[PDB]
Amino acid sequence: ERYENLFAQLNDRREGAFVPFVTLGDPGIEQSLKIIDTLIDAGADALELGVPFSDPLADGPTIQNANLRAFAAGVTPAQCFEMLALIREKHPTIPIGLLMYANLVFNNGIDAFYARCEQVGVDSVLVADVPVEESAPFRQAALRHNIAPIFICPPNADDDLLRQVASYGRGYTYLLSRSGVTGAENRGALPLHHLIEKLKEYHAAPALQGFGISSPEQVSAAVRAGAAGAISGSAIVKIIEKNLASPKQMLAELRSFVSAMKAASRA
Amino acid sequence: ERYENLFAQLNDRREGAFVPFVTLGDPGIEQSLKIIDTLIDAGADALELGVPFSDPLADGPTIQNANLRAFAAGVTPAQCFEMLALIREKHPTIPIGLLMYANLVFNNGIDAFYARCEQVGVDSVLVADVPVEESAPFRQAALRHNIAPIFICPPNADDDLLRQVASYGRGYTYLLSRSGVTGAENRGALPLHHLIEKLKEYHAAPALQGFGISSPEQVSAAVRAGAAGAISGSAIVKIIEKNLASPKQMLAELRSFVSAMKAASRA
Amino acid sequence: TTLLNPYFGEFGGMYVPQILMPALNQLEEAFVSAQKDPEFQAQFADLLKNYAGRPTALTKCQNITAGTRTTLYLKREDLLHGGAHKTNQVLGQALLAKRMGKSEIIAETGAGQHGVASALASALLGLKCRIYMGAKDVERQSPNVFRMRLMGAEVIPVHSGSATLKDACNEALRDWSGSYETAHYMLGTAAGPHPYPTIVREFQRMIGEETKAQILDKEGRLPDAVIACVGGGSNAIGMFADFINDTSVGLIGVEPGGHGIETGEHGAPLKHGRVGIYFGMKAPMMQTADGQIEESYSISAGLDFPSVGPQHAYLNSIGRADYVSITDDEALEAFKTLCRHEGIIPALESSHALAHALKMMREQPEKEQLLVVNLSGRGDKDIFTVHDILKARGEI
Amino acid sequence: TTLLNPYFGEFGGMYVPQILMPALNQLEEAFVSAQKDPEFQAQFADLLKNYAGRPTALTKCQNITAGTRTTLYLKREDLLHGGAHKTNQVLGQALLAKRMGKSEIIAETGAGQHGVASALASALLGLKCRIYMGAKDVERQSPNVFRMRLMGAEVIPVHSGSATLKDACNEALRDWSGSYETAHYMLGTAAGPHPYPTIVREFQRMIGEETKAQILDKEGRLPDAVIACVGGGSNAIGMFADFINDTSVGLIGVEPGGHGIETGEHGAPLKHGRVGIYFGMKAPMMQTADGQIEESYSISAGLDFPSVGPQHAYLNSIGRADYVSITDDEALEAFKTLCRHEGIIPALESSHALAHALKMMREQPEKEQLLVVNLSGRGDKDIFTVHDILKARGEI
Numbered sequence A, B: 001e002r003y004e005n006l007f008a009q010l011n012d013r014r015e016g017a018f019v020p021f022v023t024l025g026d027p028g029i030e031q032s033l034k035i036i037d038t039l040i041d042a043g044a045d046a047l048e049l050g051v052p053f054s055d056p057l058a059d060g061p062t063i064q065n066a067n068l069r070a071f072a073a074g075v076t077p078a079q080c081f082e083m084l085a086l087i088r089e090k091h092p093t094i095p096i097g098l099l100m101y102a103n104l105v106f107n108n109g110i111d112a113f114y115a116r117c118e119q120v121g122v123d124s125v126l127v128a129d130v131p132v133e134e135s136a137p138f139r140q141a142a143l144r145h146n147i148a149p150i151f152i153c154p155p156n157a158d159d160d161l162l163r164q165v166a167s168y169g170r171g172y173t174y175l176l177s178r179s180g181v182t183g184a185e186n187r188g189a190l191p192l193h194h195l196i197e198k199l200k201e202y203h204a205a206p207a208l209q210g211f212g213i214s215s216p217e218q219v220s221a222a223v224r225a226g227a228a229g230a231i232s233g234s235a236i237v238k239i240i241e242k243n244l245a246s247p248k249q250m251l252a253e254l255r256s257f258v259s260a261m262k263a264a265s266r267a
Numbered sequence C, D: 001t002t003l004l005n006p007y008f009g010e011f012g013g014m015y016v017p018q019i020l021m022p023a024l025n026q027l028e029e030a031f032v033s034a035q036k037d038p039e040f041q042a043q044f045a046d047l048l049k050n051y052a053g054r055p056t057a058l059t060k061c062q063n064i065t066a067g068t069r070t071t072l073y074l075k076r077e078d079l080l081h082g083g084a085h086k087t088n089q090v091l092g093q094a095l096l097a098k099r100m101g102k103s104e105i106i107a108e109t110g111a112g113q114h115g116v117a118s119a120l121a122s123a124l125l126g127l128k129c130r131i132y133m134g135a136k137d138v139e140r141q142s143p144n145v146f147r148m149r150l151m152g153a154e155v156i157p158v159h160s161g162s163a164t165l166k167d168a169c170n171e172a173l174r175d176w177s178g179s180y181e182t183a184h185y186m187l188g189t190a191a192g193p194h195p196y197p198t199i200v201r202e203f204q205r206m207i208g209e210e211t212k213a214q215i216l217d218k219e220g221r222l223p224d225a226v227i228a229c230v231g232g233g234s235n236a237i238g239m240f241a242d243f244i245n246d247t248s249v250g251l252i253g254v255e256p257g258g259h260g261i262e263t264g265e266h267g268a269p270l271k272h273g274r275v276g277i278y279f280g281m282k283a284p285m286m287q288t289a290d291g292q293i294e295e296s297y298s299i300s301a302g303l304d305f306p307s308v309g310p311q312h313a314y315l316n317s318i319g320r321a322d323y324v325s326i327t328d329d330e331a332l333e334a335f336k337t338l339c340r341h342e343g344i345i346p347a348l349e350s351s352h353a354l355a356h357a358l359k360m361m362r363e364q365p366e367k368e369q370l371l372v373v374n375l376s377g378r379g380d381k382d383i384f385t386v387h388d389i390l391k392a393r394g395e396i
């Protein structure tokens, strides 16, 4: 499937994946779709997409304000899934991962949520406030609907957690750069080689590092450390924010940034 | 002495005494002396004079404001005694009684206070916050200096108190019209014939009724009930207050009021 | 893996980002160890008695039940140091923080009552305390804010969202997720992820334990019911816990009805919400059809929270406890009635519980019933709020 | 004639207008009868325990004596219902008022603390309460005024004189002199005419009685000294009384030094005044050379009174008790220190006593001494006063 095919192709080319994140519908449905098409056309290997949530407790102010902009434009989960279907129609091979908050998954039924993900062509789901210890009904529903359940490897991971994530996760492993919440200003500086190596020993899904990644030097550093790729969200969102009143210049600067970040992944 | 001679003369004429009260030095030393000369010339049989005190707890607002006016003019007890000496030089026979608060008597020595009263020619002293039960050093000092100690017969007097007042008092007995504090607006309405009769049986000094006396009808009523006279303070002070900016009209209205009140005492 | 069961039936759990699970597991272990440790128990008891003032009085109402067959006692948590029950569990949690080697405290507050309690415990016990408080609660509760700062706490206004308790909770959790190595999150109610609902209950259960002993001493029997307000659930579970196995004793929790349930402006998720996952727990919450968390409302900032602790959700589901609501105006009338007729100024939170007890009495005045209301706090903090209401209604 | 001695040496007496002597004699008789009456004692004890919250804690300071050989305990009258020791004696006086068939209460207040206490006792016990308060204290203590009114009391601002406590006292006495038949004058301190200094002491002496038992239990010996602020004398004599015959126990009363004794702006008549007669008693008072009563000053409205109770004047004269003064700024530093280091916000009145204890410790830090400070009230009422001071001094 899509993650397995991506990582095999990137491995052939000796490349890491660059995976941008945006909030669906920020600043609007139509500009968000143009934003996503621009991220792909400028070199995004995969996508991570957030569904606007009222109380995003893992996000710093940048992504909080992205959610508020989406809500100001009236974006609902149902509209987000209509976007996802259109994105999948445009881009049949790119892996699409969702970053969800638990209540939006649980609201009208866990199974129904993953069924809808399958209908629109989503490849993976990470539920930010569902640790592996609470994941059973979520990962079962995901696998039942051919969705990869994504799990987080935090920098304080112990060995029993390493084995759990390696065993239950599919698609990719989310390698946290640091503690705290999302945010470009806060750079993760702790070395992660040890965790990357253990994940590989236990045959975990390939690791993508996320949180605080805002420069090409950080992308190459994660690749150089063994990670299969890097995720960048707040850095991307600040460009949207900085250019709200200049939609064209926004897309231009997004392409410039994505291209440079993806270039640094070509080790 | 002066009280005994007054009451003998009034008894001959079948008259009650009208005894005005003012605060010494209200609104000033010189106007106060003119006020007192006017009260006498208009028919006052005796005088009751207050020394301005900082916290007059037996006085209502009218006499509180009299004290404040006196203090505004810088009136001190020492200046009050200089006034008393001058008043005695002008009027050798009229009884002069002081209404004092205890701290002004006790301040620089009880005996010294009564000695000064004797020097200036004062005839009696009533200490408003010294009940008969606390009076020993006060009445001893008074008698030692040929000053009559005045005691209050309140409307709730019991028989043991009647005998005490009749035994320890000299000059006159202060017959309270009512409970509360000084004030012309509050008229005493409780019949006092019973107390007046008991005082006479026990050979008390003649009774002067005070508190709330503000009309000639109240003067004649007290005389008719057996009292030897009546005291009026707040009624007099309100005339001073009403006419502060018109010194001449003040003296005129004082004379009009005193003459009518004294007329009603001629039973 | 956990040492203790994280769920009460369907409700509860540990729905936090993976990064925080070590902190939660360490806290559970420290708590289980502490509960078996005589030295910890002795230090906690010493603080409760000699610093906070336990045991608190159980006051028989003299005037407000006249003409009825209701006997009403008030459990006087208003007399605890700090002015509310919050002080009980903050002293235990602060001791746990020290047992774990933590030097800093994070806490959220709405009534400012848990903030004051966290600030005073940190001052006593040598911890550095930072408090998150909705900026609307900041500009309304400036006196309590100053109290916290006087006691050396940092108070951080929160402007996001409704600018009230839910938003303070969010920021506290965001903070604790990059500071758990040195900071203990002193959660202020019996909610949030395991082990908090269990810890807060165990550090509040002296309320009901004392009440039981006191009522047996004064009346020779257990109450027909005990009544407590429910914002997140700490004071109510503290009163309820020791009576759960006394099946004849009714347990009544009172959620804020705000302007009226029918208006949507209330804080009554347990009876008028829908199960969801947020705040680290699976619990009833006020939410839109799409699963967005709704904003709550109450005249009482301490009850202005769109969820509720999982043990109450469970006790309701099985019918052991009953939950009702009381509106702003009903709470205000109870506040005034207690002031004028017993000389006790109650917290507006606690006035919700009193208001329901008054209803039980007035609706059935010849029903013989022995009731206990948990007077969770004093109403000193609320006199300005109440004044501005009475002035706006031409009543003063 | 009286049943009890109205004087303590030279000081005391009954210097009231003759009209009020029957009221005073009736009160003395009711008090002597009540003190021999088991039913009165049982009702008073019941109210103190189950309504007001006695006994109060004795708190060992954990942090403010570090680095010294002083052990410091705080007697926690701040934890009594209403927030100060005042509640003790108002409950007894209200019961006496009922014993005498009185239906109304007159009281004066400066801190608003005795006003609040009178209002709450009247509400509980069914009495109609009117409170006199200096209009300057009114416009500064509007929160407490509203509390009193909430509890059904009438609050009457007094604009005369200094517009503070002395002036409230004057109006209360003027009122009681035309209303004694139906109103009881609930004097708020151990001053005024006999029998008030004796009654207030006897209805406050549980403070020292409890303290003694508590210190023997925790330390096995009596304190080296007990320390209390002195505005009129109630909280100090309540702490002192049971130790008077324990001649090794120092008794230290702390008068307000205001801006400094040398400025004349203080409330320290016992050491810096002159004996006089006012307020119904012979006692030290601040007065001019001519015998006019001077106005006092303190940052603390509860200590802003230019006289003092006669039993303190007597205990000082014979050397049984020692009296000192503490300035505004020293009191403020003690307030801040207790907030930050023990998590207790003290009344500014009580902060004078703490400030002197801190001085005893800091001046002689290797002196081994066991001290008790009477923490007469909590400082909730004072947080605005303190805030406006700290803002004016650029400290916040």
Ligand SMILES: Cc1ncc(COP(=O)(O)O)c(/C=N/[C@@H](C[C@@H]2C(=O)Nc3ccccc32)C(=O)O)c1O
Pocket: C083, C084, C085, C108, C109, C110, C111, C112, C113, C114, C115, C165, C169, C187, C188, C189, C190, C191, C229, C230, C231, C232, C233, C234, C235, C236, C301, C302, C303, C305, C347, C349, C350, C376, C377, C378
């Ligand atoms: C006097 C008094 N009585 C009752 C209560 C109600 O609380 P419970 O339902 O748990 O019993 C309070 C409330 N206090 C708090 C709120 C409390 C807290 O601290 N965090 C938190 C998180 C979610 C919900 C509620 C809370 C405050 O505003 O600080 C109160 O102050």
Ligand SMILES: Cc1ncc(COP(=O)(O)O)c(/C=N/[C@@H](C[C@@H]2C(=O)Nc3ccccc32)C(=O)O)c1O
Pocket: D083, D084, D085, D108, D109, D110, D111, D112, D113, D114, D115, D165, D169, D187, D188, D189, D190, D191, D229, D230, D231, D232, D233, D234, D235, D236, D301, D302, D303, D305, D347, D349, D350, D376, D377, D378
């Ligand atoms: C918390 C606290 N601690 C200490 C004290 C000090 O009083 P003591 O010296 O007697 O111990 C107070 C004071 N309270 C009072 C004042 C009190 C009163 O009521 N009438 C009256 C008359 C003359 C002098 C003083 C008083 C208030 O302002 O109401 C206080 O509030």
Ligand SMILES: O=P(O)(O)OC[C@@H](O)CO
Pocket: A021, A048, A063, A099, A181, A182, A183, A184, A210, A211, A212, A213, A231, A232, A233, A234, A235
């Ligand atoms: O926002 P940042 O800090 O880049 O974190 C990545 C996150 O937004 C997507 O997983």
Ligand SMILES: O=P(O)(O)OC[C@@H](O)CO
Pocket: B021, B048, B063, B099, B181, B182, B183, B184, B210, B211, B212, B213, B231, B232, B233, B234, B235
């Ligand atoms: O003021 P009145 O009410 O007249 O009372 C008399 C008093 O002022 C003098 O003894």
Ligand code: NA
Pocket: C230, C231, C232, C267, C268, C269, C303, C304, C305, C306, C307, C308
């Ligand atoms: Na709630």
Ligand code: NA
Pocket: D230, D231, D232, D267, D268, D269, D303, D304, D305, D306, D307, D308
């Ligand atoms: Na004084």
